[PDB]
Amino acid sequence: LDCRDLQRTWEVIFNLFEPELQEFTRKVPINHIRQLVEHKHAKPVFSSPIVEGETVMVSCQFTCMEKTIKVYGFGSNKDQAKLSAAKHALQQLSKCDA
Amino acid sequence: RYTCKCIYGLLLNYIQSTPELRNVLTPQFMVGRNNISPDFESVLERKWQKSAIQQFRDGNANLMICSSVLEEGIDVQACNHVFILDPVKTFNMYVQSK
């Protein structure tokens, strides 16, 4: 609204976005549990969630390229715990895939 | 309001201690809405659904603790006794309580 130049706004946006633009073009981010499912080699075996109080735990066992590592996701909602466990399994798999 | 719950608990304990009042008496209490929890155990859930007024009218509870709600025009079974534990404040309060 101030500059009223699309090129200037584009310059500002690119200056703000360059590291993420470079990183994401090299490796496109996708949904974490969808990524884990699309990594069929891991075969993520998520157990059914259980609830204690108002917090829900989801336990997962996935083949981390050498072992069936067991991880637990904790969150206020069943999907929240699902996502937490999925992301933690993904980071463990990434560390093993060094 | 809190006086209702407090005296309800005291009456429960006193009735249960005495051998005479043990069987004859059965207390029950009420305040307005924002209904305070009728339990002292801090349990997350209570399954009970029957109203206190129905228990009183049906003869389930024959000793009703009430606060400025059961005073106005509440039709009930033939009540042999009425106790005004706190001093009367207003003319209409006295009239309706009588």
Binding site: - | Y2, T3, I7
Partner: protein
């Protein structure tokens, strides 16, 4: 007297009915109300009631 100095984060300003006298934030007022009611119960009905 300890709680009046708690310095909770920013809270809605509370004032009297005609808006000249200030009041404590809702949480402090609620805690004080509970304790005052307990004191009233103890004073009026006895130790067992408390």
């Amino acid at each position: 007297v300890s709680l009046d100095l708690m310095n909770i984060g920013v809270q809605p300003i509370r004032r009297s009915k005609s808006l000249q006298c200030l009041r404590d934030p809702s949480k402090k007022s609620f805690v004080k109300q509970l304790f005052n009611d307990f004191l009233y119960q103890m004073k009026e009905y006895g130790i067992y009631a408390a």
